């Protein structure tokens, strides 16, 4: 196989568990914001620098794949120069040059040192070794390339905001062209080319050890910076912030990586297929990666659209764990048969209720100890969350259990899937909440709760078969699919026509609904359907058990 797909999960884990720990330490208070600059100034001015140099000295130049390069750096420059264009037309005047300025670096630049190189190694480097260089030449590459353009329109915006200043053009073009240079992933990737033509790739035995403390050093200390520095940041946005946000993530997290295989499937004219399928997964993984934390960096340093970039990195960087775990296994299944593309839905399944459950636990916890779970809406999102918890427990359970009994199935299988009815039920009925709240009324709390479980629970006594099914969603049949539909068409039809009434805390909760009403239409769509049928069976999978950690990432 191109990608060992099963090693992904653990290196997510391991890069998004550091940056949780960080996260977690900033919050507790371990490390203020003043204490944690202590550490970004470790990562940045010598773990990052010295992980450069020395992968710059190693270097194989007579073994890169400069059409790789070329792709990923061209769809790079194509996603800067739409997001550039369209923003330089759509913002107003009073910031639209900051906004071109960042806007397009954000949509392009990836966290590729801290989140990439753990990935892109964990997946490629026993299959494809010679990946794990590009992250060290795409990513420099794009900063020099790009990000002086970018700048330009930051110092043309300060030059505008000095309202009194004639100033000459050239500063403006230098002064951004000289940010980049100052940026120590720029300069060591020059200095490390420079060492690595002196020194034949060989570095010196006696400075190799150095470079390699340090820049192992970076990798861990790099995501609990990432973490600590996550803390605080999302800030409420506009309607217009939190619209123009969702597109510039969707240029980075889906633009761009299209734009990057479609790319190397334009500019790869190599004849290997595998060579060239793994190639093109790899431009899509490596489009996927989150906006660089320097971004941010370079907006509090011009101290322009701070809150967009700031937050939008933060999402971005969460957004983006869901995203590549999903797009690294969707990428993987055309090369696997129906038996092995089973286990693999079963594996993912496992794989995400494993995160979804502990965000499970911790949401809960919060609200059961924060005694939100008294107050409305959150009693309804509380029981909403013990449905998506035991939705993950029936995950595990059926990973176990899946064809090792006949009864436990059954129960397995009534618990499970009574749960996951309750969960579409709760979505709609949460969204009812919402709009029963919104006009002023007494609202029916004990009937809406024995509703959201009993429906559920009376819909699975209805459908009490496939005994050798290795996927839950079918144990009981097209009978079975048509009890789901029906459970999902009413959830979307009570929660679409409630949000839409509403529309005539409670703003967060109207992002969960919408956010799980996205999810309940991909589990539509893939019962009313019954290739694409895999993929969507890995949609409805990834939310049915990983929608508590859409219920986490908006409440936690
Ligand atoms: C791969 C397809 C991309 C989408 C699944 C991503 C790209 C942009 C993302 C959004 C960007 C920002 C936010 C704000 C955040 O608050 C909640 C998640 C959300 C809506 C994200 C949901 C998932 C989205 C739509
Ligand atoms: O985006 C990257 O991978 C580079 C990077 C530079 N400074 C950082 C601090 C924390 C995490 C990543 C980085």
């Given at each position: 196989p191109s990608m060992s797909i099963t090693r992904l999960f653990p290196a997510l884990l391991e890069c998004f568990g550091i940056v949780l720990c960080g996260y977690i330490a900033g919050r507790a208070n371990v490390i203020t914001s003043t204490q944690a600059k202590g550490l970004g100034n470790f990562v940045s001015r010598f773990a990052l620098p010295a992980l450069l140099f020395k992968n710059m000295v190693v270097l194989n130049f007579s073994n890169v794949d400069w059409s790789f390069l070329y792709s990923i750096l061209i769809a790079k420059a194509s996603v800067f120069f739409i997001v550039c264009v369209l923003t330089l037309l759509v913002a107003?005047?009073?910031?639209r040059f900051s906004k071109a300025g960042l806007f397009p670096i954000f949509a392009t630049?990836?966290?590729?040192?801290?989140?990439g190189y753990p990935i892109v190694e964990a997946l490629y480097?026993?299959?494809?070794?010679?990946?794990?260089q590009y992250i060290y030449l795409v990513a420099p590459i794009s900063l020099m390339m790009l990000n002086p353009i970018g700048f330009i329109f930051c110092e043309i915006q300060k030059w505008k905001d000095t309202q009194n200043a004639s100033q000459n053009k050239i500063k403006i073009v230098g002064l951004g062209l000289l940010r980049v240079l100052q940026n120590p992933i720029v300069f060591m990737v020059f200095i490390g080319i420079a060492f690595n033509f002196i020194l034949d790739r060989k570095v010196p035995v006696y400075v190799e050890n150095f470079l390699d403390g340090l820049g192992n050093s970076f990798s861990g200390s790099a995501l609990f910076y990432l973490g600590l520095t996550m803390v605080g940041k999302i800030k409420r946005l506009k309607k217009s912030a939190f619209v123009v946000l969702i597109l510039l993530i969707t240029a980075k997290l889906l633009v761009l990586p299209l734009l990057c295989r479609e790319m190397v499937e334009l500019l790869?004219?190599?004849?290997?297929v595998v060579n060239h399928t793994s190639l093109s997964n790899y431009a899509f993984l490596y489009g996927v990666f989150?906006?660089?934390?320097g971004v941010a960096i370079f907006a509090t340093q011009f101290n322009m659209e701070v809150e967009i970039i700031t937050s939008g990195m933060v999402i971005s960087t969460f957004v983006s764990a869901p995203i590549m775990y999903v797009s690294a296994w969707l990428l993987t299944?055309?090369?696997?048969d129906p038996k092995p593309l089973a286990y693999a839905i079963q594996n993912v399944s496992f794989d995400i209720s494993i995160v979804s459950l502990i965000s499970l636990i911790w949401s809960l916890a919060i609200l059961l100890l924060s005694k939100k779970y008294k107050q409305l809406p959150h009693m309804l999102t509380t029981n909403l969350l013990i449905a998506q918890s035991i939705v993950c427990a029936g995950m595990m359970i059926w990973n176990f259990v899946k064809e090792k009994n006949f009864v436990g199935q059954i129960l397995v299988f009534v618990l499970l899937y009574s749960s996951l009815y309750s969960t579409y039920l709760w979505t709609g009925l949460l969204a009812i909440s919402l709009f029963l709240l919104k006009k002023r009324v007494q609202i029916p709390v004990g009937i809406i709760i024995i509703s959201g479980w009993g429906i559920p629970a009376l819909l699975v006594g209805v459908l009490?078969?496939?005994?050798?099914?290795?996927?839950?969603?079918?144990?009981?049949?097209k009978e079975q699919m048509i009890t789901t539909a029906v459970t999902l068409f009413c959830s979307i039809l009570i929660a679409g026509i409630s949000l839409m009434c509403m529309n005539q805390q409670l703003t967060r909760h109207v992002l969960l609904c919408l956010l799980l009403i996205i999810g309940l239409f991909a589990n539509l769509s893939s019962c009313l359907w019954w290739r694409l049928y895999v993929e969507l069976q890995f949609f409805c999978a990834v939310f049915n058990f990983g929608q508590g950690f859409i219920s986490f990432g908006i409440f936690g």
């Open positions: 107003s005047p009073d910031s630049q990836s966290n590729d040192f801290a989140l480097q026993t299959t494809y070794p010679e990946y794990l790869d004219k190599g004849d290997s989150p906006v660089a934390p299944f055309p090369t696997m009490l078969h496939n005994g050798d099914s290795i996927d839950s969603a079918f144990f009981y049949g």
